Structures are given as structure tokens and as C-alpha cells.
Amino acid sequence: VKVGDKAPLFEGIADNGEKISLSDYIGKHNIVLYFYPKDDTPGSTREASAFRDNWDLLKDYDVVVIGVSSDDINSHKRFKEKYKLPFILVSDPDKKIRELYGAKGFILPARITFVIDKKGIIRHIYNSQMNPANHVNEALKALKQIKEEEIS
Template sequence: MVKIGDKAPLFEAVADNGERINLADFIGKHNIVLYFYPKDDTPGCTREACAFRDNWNLLKDYDVVVIGVSSDDINSHRKFKEKYQLPFILVSDPDKKIRELYGAKGFILPDRVTFVIDKKGIIRHIYKSQFNPANHVNEALNTLKKIKEEELSSSQR
């Protein structure tokens, strides 16, 4: 698995709207919350996605792009996103190559792990918890707050 302080591995993937996205397009412009989850529309994954949705106004304060990744296909992502009105990007990773890049493969179930990546493309926080899906957004927000404080203090120098 990648570690805190590593450069985030770059990838290209198909998003829920059918368009290709490239992680490199966000680096230098936004902080990124990249979260891996097992499966669309299952109880834990729904709790996790809805926690990100319910905290969307707080997340927006940190100039962040949120990307959820699972091996579900685009149609599944589209339905999941519509059903729960998710305001962020979902990408399909059918061959689990993105999971592999980040070391988020898991054993029996695919890992539920969240990476917070700063604007420079550096991994600042990793939170892994299969059984506390709603806490992933709290972990991300705490890290984004620290990043923003660092940016403010360095701009005041």
C-alpha cells in the first residue's frame, strides 16, 4: 500500500457520466479525497457515500474533489448516484488496477479505504475501516482542515 508522504499514483478511469477522468487533471488545482469501497448500494457502502453527501457543504469549503472507486460498472454507478443524489464522482475499476496502484485490494472483501491527497499530489492521510463506513468523511474533513491551516499559515509568511 502507498504511504502517507508518497506521491499519489496517477490513473485514468471512466466516471459515472461516461467520461474519462485523469487524476493528474485535479492535481495542482484541488485537494482530492479518493475513497475505495466494495460495492454500490450495499448497506455499508451506502452509509459511507451518504456520509460524504451529507457533509458536502463542509467538504466544498476545502476546495476538494471527491472520487469514489469500486469495481461496479458505469450503469451501477449511475443508478447508485441517482438513487442517493450523490454530488461527487464515481469511477469504475472493473479490473481492480486502481486498487492495485494504491494497495487497496483487501482479502475476502475489497478494502474500504480513504486517501486524502493535497494539491501537490501528496498523500496526506489514509484511513482504513471496513466496519465504520460513516467515519471516512470525518477523517477526510480533519485532514482537509489541517491542510487548509497549513496553506493559510504559509501564505501569511
């Protein structure tokens, strides 16, 4: 998976117990798909919080934010409710979505974020375990680049 490739399609279960298909968003909105190790931990909470804190700004870039981890649905709802996260959280029980995106990691699940445009093309990849809060900034920079190409 590299910048320029079509984003791999997948189906999973969202925190609302509903099934989610990436293809249902492809072409309709820009997409920020971010992988994080585990629910309600210092770093992932910080990353999720950063995305929450920029929710309104993200609205200007026509985008859907989807978080992914190996935690189950209930863990996702609790994490989401506990920090008032407004976006979607997908459960990846057997790590199949991670494998698809090459985000399995080695000493632990990779904290990697992908920004996908309306043509279903990956426009940016940011892989960094140590800078959880910076993931939203990188997603925003990619979204700004994309918007800048749309506007004119």
C-alpha cells in the same frame, strides 16, 4: 502507498461515461479518493451518504471527491441517482486502480480513503471496513490540517 508519497496517477471511466485522469485534478484541488466494496449496499451507501451530507462543508476545503469500486458505469449512475450523490464515481472493472493504491483487500475489497494535497502528496490514509460513516470525518480532519497550513 504511504503518507508522504506522491499519489499514483491513473485513468478511468467516470459515472458520466467520461474518462477521468487523476492528473487533471492534481495541483488544482485537494483530493479525497475513496474505495468502497460495492454499490448500493448498507455500508457503502452509508459511506456515500455521509460524504453527501457533508458536501457543503467540503466546499470550504477546496476538494474534489472521487469514489471508486469495481461496479460498472450504469451501476454507478443508478447508485448515484438513488441517493442523490453529488460527487464522482469511477469504475475499476479489473481492479487496476485498487491494485495501484494497495486497496485490493484480502477477504474483500478494502474500504480505504486517501486524502491528497495540491502538491499531489498523500496526506492521510484511513482504512476501516466497519466504520463507513467515519471515512468522511477522517477526510475532513485531514482537509482541516491542510487548510490550517494554507491559511498560515
